[PDB]
């Protein structure tokens, strides 16, 4: 919509606020395709390395790849807590 995420926001911030802001903004961004597993998805994706996400979120083959992978991983734990 306006004023999208920028590496600057994290550049002028601590190593804690990073995952906070980034993950917080990525939470909804993931819901675009997985509004259910958006949580776990953003969680693992935020663990690997926030920096990587700041460069992966700028690509379709990457974004969809991460989301898909994550969701696939949760397949072992639980999908919608209905098992």
């Amino acid at each position: 919509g306006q004023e999208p995420l920028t590496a600057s926001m994290l550049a002028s911030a601590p190593p804690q606020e990073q995952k906070q802001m980034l993950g917080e903004r990525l939470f909804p961004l993931i819901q675009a395709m997985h509004p259910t597993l958006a949580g776990k998805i953003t969680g693992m994706l935020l663990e690997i390395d926030n920096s990587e996400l700041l460069h992966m979120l700028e690509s379709p083959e990457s974004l969809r790849s991460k989301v898909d992978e994550a969701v696939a991983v949760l397949q072992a734990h639980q999908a919608k807590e209905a098992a």
């Binding site: 995952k19 906070q20 993950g23 917080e24 776990k40 969680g43 935020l46 992978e69």
Partner: peptide
């Protein structure tokens, strides 16, 4: 994520939700 699959036990993050 790295080679094929990743860990699901990986904690989420540090949100700003208290109450």
């Amino acid at each position: 994520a790295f080679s094929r699959q990743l860990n699901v036990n990986a904690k989420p993050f540090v949100p700003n939700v208290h109450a």
